[PDB]
Design a protein around this ligand. Structure first.
Ligand SMILES: [Zn+2]
Ligand SMILES: [Zn+2]
Ligand SMILES: [Zn+2]
Length: 178
């Protein structure tokens, strides 16, 4: 296996996948690495299994249909995976913890949102449809763009949103368009 965490790229106390070479810190994996389970398979492997069991799951879908799906176990897992793909980028650090807003000429958002809040919400089964998870993830980047206005720091929100959206389209097999 790898000797660094797949998510944050640091060494430390690592848990190794039994079915692929990836490794994880306990709370870098989502869900947090499970206490027992020998063998253990990582979220990458669990997602690959879903795909391999239902090859048709990779055919194109409409976003509006995906958003309305109830959060049954496979959709829960897919949203956990999508959240983990965003943490995989180092720029996620800007969006992880609870923000605060005190900038001349701007007012904070009405509904602050951040990655660790979405993580807790998934863990606590607070989302009943894919739509709830996706709306809170998009709200993170929309809040940032609105607050930073013309400051060049706005670009960090575009960047991390692009990682979210590309992974959303991949994981949920959204129909390709121009
Ligand atoms: Zn890590
Ligand atoms: Zn694995
Ligand atoms: Zn089948």
């Amino acid at each position: 296996n790898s000797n660094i965490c797949e998510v944050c790229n640091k060494w430390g106390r690592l848990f190794c996948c039994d079915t692929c070479p990836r490794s994880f810190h306990e709370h870098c994996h989502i869900p947090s690495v499970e206490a027992n389970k020998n063998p253990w398979s990582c979220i990458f492997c669990r997602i690959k299994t879903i795909q391999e069991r239902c090859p048709e799951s990779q055919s194109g879908h409409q976003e509006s249909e995906v958003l309305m799906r109830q959060m049954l176990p496979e959709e829960q897992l897919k949203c956990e995976f999508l959240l983990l793909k965003v943490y995989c980028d180092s720029k996620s650090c800007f969006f992880a913890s609870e923000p605060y807003y005190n900038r001349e000429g701007s007012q904070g958002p009405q509904k602050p949102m951040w990655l660790n809040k979405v993580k807790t919400s998934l863990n606590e089964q607070m989302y009943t449809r894919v739509e709830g998870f996706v709306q809170d993830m998009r709200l993170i980047f929309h809040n940032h763009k609105e607050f930073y206005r013309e400051d060049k720091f706005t670009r960090l929100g575009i960047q991390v949103q692009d990682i979210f959206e590309k992974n959303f389209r991949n994981i949920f097999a959204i129909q390709e368009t121009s």
